[model samples]
Target chain A: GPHMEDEAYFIAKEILATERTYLKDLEVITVWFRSVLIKEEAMPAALMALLFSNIDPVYEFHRGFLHEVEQRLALWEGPSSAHLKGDHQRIGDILLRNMRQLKEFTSYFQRHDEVLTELEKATKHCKKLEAVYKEFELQKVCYLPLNTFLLKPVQRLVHYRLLLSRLCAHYSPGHRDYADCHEALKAITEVTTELQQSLTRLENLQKLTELQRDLV
Target chain B: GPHMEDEAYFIAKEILATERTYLKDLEVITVWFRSVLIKEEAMPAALMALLFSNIDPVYEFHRGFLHEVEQRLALWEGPSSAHLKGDHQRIGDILLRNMRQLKEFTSYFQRHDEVLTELEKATKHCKKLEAVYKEFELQKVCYLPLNTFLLKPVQRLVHYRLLLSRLCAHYSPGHRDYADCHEALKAITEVTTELQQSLTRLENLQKLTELQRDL
Candidate 1:
């Protein structure tokens, strides 16, 4: 290995590690909880449509995003190549492309507050539905509150934006990754701001919602 | 500078950064909330005693702990010392001494969960107390729940133990700081493990306490 490690590689490595955690957070709902919700008929058709329709695509998207990232990291870890250009050395392009596609689901993310409210209300009112919801929370799969998981996809976009900002700060303007990191930050920032109003709403509601749970 | 940076320096820098946040977490209760509890008469006499008495000493200890760390870090950051050798270069002794003193509060740390349950119950039963509790949660200073603040001091021990373990992991045997770092970890680990059973009780209550909040 002739090359010294760039701060960019460490940032990318952090992105990969954080991305792994984010995907598992998604699967808690999309994979494990989804099975219980249907297998138990805990939710009705229209409600299920609203909930999973939003998350599953976001879920599927990250699975691919993480696979590609690991490939880049694995490549980066290999002995320095004589002909390897800086293009393959960068991850900002991958981030930019993936983040841009997320614009497709911006509206879906906005609906998560409604998904959370509906799920809590759904669990509250129905006896059979309520039992499963409580039991599911007690399940090891849901480490955080079920609603916290519902909020993750939007929260995840914020994490990406934050990580990219770190990358942009570390890179000089003339560096190879600078432009793509900026664009990726811009892309995700737009998505976050579009949902930003709801971001506070979700978090405040999240905070108060827990208060309500503690009392009840 | 004659020498390059050691990983220990980075770890010490982090220790400084992390300890700054830790003191402020204590100040939330010790200074701000403590003032509120008195000014508003929000909590009763013995109850307030139970709460503040445990935390005030711990809070005071970290204030001094953080100051010492900042000094060492500032010294470390200065242009590499001329006659000064590696003795002043280390932090583990300071950490070891500070952490060993914390063993004084091991029993105090055990009482935090009771402090939490009682605080929550006090808020619930007394209408005035309940209003202030709810409103305090709204207060900008009480950024997280009040009970979350109660849990932090003990949680803070776990944090100290974790940081020392990180330091020990970075240092090899026979390094100048190695013995002190090892002793610091041993001291804090003993404190944490002594309170370890209650640590789980505190966390499980914290989780469900929020769950009880959410529904």
Candidate 2:
């Protein structure tokens, strides 16, 4: 670590790190849990599809997002000759592109309530499904509470917005990266207005549940 | 939103943030899961004791660790009139004390293998226990992979060591905070030598499981 290699670079790296972790987390439901339930006939077709249909597109969206972010970071750090002075040096252009595109999936995020409760409703009726569900929870892949995995897609929107805000703060309005960062911030904020309350209540619920654990 | 912070301040803040999350994580096993099993009579007395017993002390230990780190950061960031030039200014002393004392829990981490397997065996024989386990997993707080939570105690050692290494990099040998940070890093590194393999194997195992999930 040099004394200071652009603050935006560190912010970009955090975006990369957390995005990597977040993508892997999605597979706990989208890939692994979906696979297991299918193999075991643990969940009904409509019910299971409800869960994966909502998430699969979001997961697919991020795979591209992560790939582009990785490529941009590599270029940003690569040989100076590879890119001209300012063009490829900053992350805001890529962020702006994705944040604009992410709006297409707002419906998927807004429908999150159905997916969460459907799984529970499905679990309530079938003993075998319930048992399989329990077993998967213990598996290393399903880490964290299972619902937390379901809760992350919209949360990721919040994460990206926060990252862009950090970048915006670092770069002034006239700076090359600042406009894109601000635009990116504005783009995600547009999508988040309807979706933000769940995160707040969900987090509050998370903390209260955690607090309740101690005295229980 | 005003710009400059001492850098050390941010690092200390990170130490506090992660420690808070880590303590809550510990409760997933020690408090939440433990209470669920006890009330439902899902796990045997011996098996339940094995899991919680290894972790409860660590959780209690970190409560103190989190409190001190919080207070130290507060003082470090506070009005600054409260202390003279040299005193109450840095984190190394508190870190060194706790890191040295943490050595006592070396055995608890070593036996982690037993607790993990004992949990599987306990889950194996009892249907009720297994049911209780699964229901809890869907709960919001277990927010990571379950074993990942269990693996974190030893992993926290590595986190502390990394934080100290970062802090040490910022300060040279003659610098005020360097000695305690180095000594703290060295102390934990000593304990980690015996316990480090599990984290490597565990994380590798974690990634493999996750990768396998995707394909």
Candidate 3:
């Protein structure tokens, strides 16, 4: 009981940290990378449309998701909100709902790999496109290799799985938050496990792509 | 006389255009590049302090400079301010005053080139420093080559000189704004010409840096 607050606080800490990074990853495309490609006329309109169309929904969902997580944590941590603390302490509901909602966007996540593949292929097919991609990668907002961010949504699923597991471990079977935390763990584990195999492949592909950019 | 408004409008347009890009250039170091270097613990503390101390004054100055320019242009263009438009119509006074104030920061401007040179030299001297410099340059916010932005404060002086010269050419000697425009042109030209040799060296160094990065 004494450690529950401490454990709960860590879960919130994990969410906030990941959420901050997640939002920035979303912006990597929506704000910075997208503009470079658009400004340079690097990619075809239809392909650009497909890229944003797939990512936009996921980005929108996460923006709201991060907000909710931030609010719940704020309530949990705020001094005057002690009365609201007990109810707001556990994030399983937010995690479960969004984790399930996120599952429905599996197709978008899958298409991310295709987009990465296509962009790499297009760079070979078109010199101007290749030059733009190469130059765009050099820009500061693209802190990580451009392809690395394409793996983020999937990577985030893994993060959720890890955090939820931590939440479950911290709570005992008899604890009030245990069942919900367990359910979220189960829900996200299913999605993450389903996608886990491909994540490795995508990560490898991203690494190779970055190496290619660096070398060539 | 009819075309005076056209020339004035173009002068305003040039200032606003360059100002927009200038602010983004400032952010390249102050916001984006600074964070990466700080996060990575990439640079020495004294070096980082020296880097920011030189640029921060310039950046702070521009924030106010851009605001003043924007407000002046807004009043000049706004319908309600039409009666007051004659005085607000030309920006030479604002330019003259700010240009004179900016001239006082000559040491900071010179230090920018030193900072850029030191960064490149430091990168060569240390592997970790090289990696961070290379990585920082790769970031999207470092849109241009990093050293290219180091040349901007001086490059901006040339832009000011050019715009003021254009203003002077457009105004007749007898025109109300001619004296002020001519004075501002002389002020900025003096600075630009004084720094002309250094600016050329900075440009070549930046080009070499970008090519070095590319190769």
Candidate 4:
């Protein structure tokens, strides 16, 4: 451990928190919020994008998780659309608030100022966390010891991607920054691979546990 | 609260190898992990029972939840035969273990032993949980709080059902118990409606949340 008096340790911690936790959490929640809005504002629009979007499984899960909530609530009592009108408005509002935040992050990333620089620093910290999760490929998603270490960085990377995507969609709508999109997509693809690899590993572990009984 | 003064509490508390930390200090980790295993095992089975059986939308959500996990994993790689194998075996082992206990309970129940009363109590508890989870009508499978609360009871019920079925099958193989099977089918159907109703309530809640957003 570094000396308690050292400023470097604190600085690094600060960097990680700023870049990883706050940034990524923001993005994850935003996407979650956006997905909700997409369903409410325009189900066809949302589903349409999702069909074409090539989103990560976790992202899809997150979407479905919320959608599951929404669908049940929407069709609850009556087949009448009037009964669902109230729920539609409520979900739509939560999503719209999220959309505004997406816009803000987009504008912020445009400036290569202190915020942007800090985000860049955060990205490096995110890579550290990603490395850990990818390292423990077969580990449990909710397993405490492993997850405690892995979640923070992964959250950051995801948030950063969400923030970047929102920014891009807002600012560069026409595929003008195709290179940046490609980079983001590529990085997301790798992370998605890592995530799925872990999930598959989880399934295999269960199977292997059974086969071991055969040894007896 | 009940265990604080007990010696076993102290024994167990001190037996922990790690540094002690209170829930207040680590709320999320504590809350989630506290009953993770039981819920993890039971919920999927409930979902599978509902979905493959075509029970209700509530179970559909549960099935969908599992499906989402499956899909997410599938995106990176195809399905894992091993995971499915493990799940089948693990649950199978649990079922067999419980069946033994249930058999003993049945023998006791038959003899009218004091334990017979307890066995009946256990059987009722199982039915109560099952009643709550019954078809898609009054209850939804995804009312996680309720499901979580009822998980142990539900698992026990699964055992009880299996035990009852095994006994009936063994004793009355040639005997046509159409009435018994009919009752089972009716109970399942009734619960399906409950599950549907519960799903409807949840859907309404989501809609209400959305409505509040607009206002």
Candidate 5:
């Protein structure tokens, strides 16, 4: 933990410095932000060792991240550039691209089979969170509820994918300044405020539902 | 530093729990040790960027270390595996190879190569440090002063080179195991100890000679 703290502090300092001089050098900044965001977001599935630790006795997040990193790196390698489309484009252009993917995926899910209903539900949850976040309030406090609960975790997933995508996208010879890699990540922090509120709502709703059942 | 720490801890915890277990096909412990050593030594270079106030500003130490790591890696990716060789044979191999190279470069320098001469000079420094330690008994007191100063850093560099050479000697297509990697790395640690001591002697001599010249 001491060493981990040291490393995290170093990275935070480094990135903070980057942000300070952050004149949006689309090429470098986008890629840098994308890498950070994606790396952050992609933690959940990879952390399945923790999530489903009971089911899988010998799985790890480091290896999972590394493997994902390798796979994404191939996209940047040029010969297989076509595979670099989809959410992969979000490496540099993170925010705009992720929203598009959420919409695109939702549309695709609508046309597809029943297994993806859970995804739809999650997406709806996110939309509600987004709407509340945009409403009048200090951006961060409004986000505290959301950030504490749903938004933080989902955002973690998004970052993971973004990083996974960047590893693939950056290697392409011609694709210099890819996409909005950090936009979703930056916004996700703001979104967390609403997520915090949602948790409170969820608790209140649960109590109301319980009260209704008692009346019945 | 913070980010790097988080990443390392995250990677270490994850690897130990997950990948280390899966690596049962080969000697996992050795490979794990080797990976950690290499990463730790090499990290000062490749990962130092993350530690800086400006990720872009090139730190020479970091750059030097990185180059050293890459060069070592290239040496490791040699034609055949050598780390598997017995200690005597491997040392002999190195001595022989070094003999050939040193023939041209350091034939005359050997007379003045006090640094190489101090590979086994720990006791001299240790005895001196022990006396000083008893006298001052300060926090830095105790044990060999020169030897202690040189031990770790030099050994790290030497081991880095040694492991690379060994890895190069043993590697073949379709067969890279944890045992082989680990042994090479262990050899690296051994070299690290030796180099550190030698470096201390060299630094000591530099100051002594400088004083004598001034007189």
Candidate 6:
């Protein structure tokens, strides 16, 4: 049997990896994209507000969540703290707490589809903006296809579900962490399944927009 | 007269501040802009090489230069090490060495103007590339006017000369650091003076490009 410590350790490692990439994706808008738009004096006022309204809270939430996860993982792995483990050994509490909090942002995530559609339309309809938009995409930081980034907040729910399922599988029914892991998996699964249709539609829309961007 | 330590401290501080901004500018091209261009598959391979060739060496050089300056400043400011200072308190040796080394990249700096011009022309001529270019500039990391970043490597030469001049003035004729400051100033000034004409043209070109981009 695998040591309980190793099972919990891998789960924390997975969260850290995903969180780092997730933070970078958020920066694509909050840090990188926002800076250019302001410099060029592009992007209209309402659209800017709407776009950020949907993303800013999510970004702020993750920055805190990532810090918590990091601090906990540090304590869990620290040599001196390793032998003192009990609740310290498990990450499911953090997952359950964050997953519940994430559910509150469900509406914001839904509005993303409208925001993406409007942004694509704005890029096509406005020439000066189109120019700024095109140039912004060519930058090294905007690594993903531009539209792909817009989908991440929605797609991340699915990632959470997958990761939680892995945690549940790793833990036995009698394991101390198993109950919390199962509960987190259920909570995130609800959010993911609820948003599943919109996620599919947004994925298709993102692909269509990318094709249009390339051809037009 | 200001204490030599205070003057040196301020000069070191200025370099740290400017280097911080300069590295971020380099990242605009090397990390942020490169990633987008690659994802889009927008820029042609040869053009990509040409664009980066001018900036990459300068970027790598400064990354090291910034590290050295940072560590030396940390040591100079460290409480335990403050009394241990000899040449450690001064940054001119580093400045003089780097300024002289930067002179070797004169050809690369000159080629940047061509890269800027060709990039501008390509954006105008090719619709698809123009789209990628516009989108790239809109990214938050490309915070400056995009063309403005292309001018940083050139503009930085003048900045070095200006800072060196201040360091020279701060150090009296008999001061230990004065001669090295004067020598570093001369080296950087020569590079800036050699490229002065192209810098002016590039600045004007950037203004024109911004106007065109906006209107």
Point to the candidate with the largest DockQ: 4
Clashing pairs for model 3 are A138-B138, A139-B139, A139-B140, A140-B139, A140-B140, A140-B141, A140-B142, A141-B140, A141-B141, A142-B140
lDDT of 3 by residue, B1-215 (tens): 01112556545645765576567778998888888887888788988898889998889988988888877765553323234447767787888888888778777876666788887787788888878777776876664556567776776676677667767887778866888878888888788777877777776676565455444
i-RMS values of the candidates, in order? 21.7, 14.5, 25.9, 22.8, 15.6, 27.3
lDDT of 2 by residue, A127-160 (tens): 9988997788789676455765666687677767
Write the residue-wise lDDT of candidate 5 on B105-197 in tens digits: 222222222422342243235554234323432333223332232223232345345535555444332222324444545554544454454
The Cα local distance difference test for each model comes to 0.74, 0.71, 0.71, 0.31, 0.33, 0.74
Which prediction has more favorable DockQ, 2 or 5? 2
Residue B136 in model 4: lDDT? 18
Per-residue error for B40 in candidate 2, Å, reads: 60
DockQ per candidate = 0.01, 0.02, 0.01, 0.03, 0.01, 0.01
| Clashing residue pair totals per candidate (backbone < 3 A) | 11, 8, 10, 32, 69, 36
Worst 10 residues of 6 chain B by lDDT: B75-84
Report the lDDT tens digits of candidate 1 across residue range B116-191.
8787788778887877778777876665676776666766676667568868987889898999999999999899
Point out where model 1 deviates above 4 Å: A1-5, B1-215
Chain B TM-score against the true chain B, each candidate: 0.92, 0.88, 0.90, 0.19, 0.23, 0.92
> Model 4, range A91-207, lDDT digits (tens) per residue?
222223333333323222222123223322443466643343344434333122221222322333343344334333433444333344445545554553444444344334433
Candidate 4 docking band: incorrect
> On a 0 to 1 DockQ scale, where is model 6?
0.01
lDDT of 6 by residue, A17-46 (tens): 557666777898988999988998778988
Model 3 residue A125 CA deviation (Å) reads 1.1
Which of the two candidates, 3 or 4, achieves a greater lDDT against the reference? 3
Q: What TM-score does prediction 2 earn?
A: 0.52
Q: Cα deviation in Å at residue B165, candidate 5? A: 21
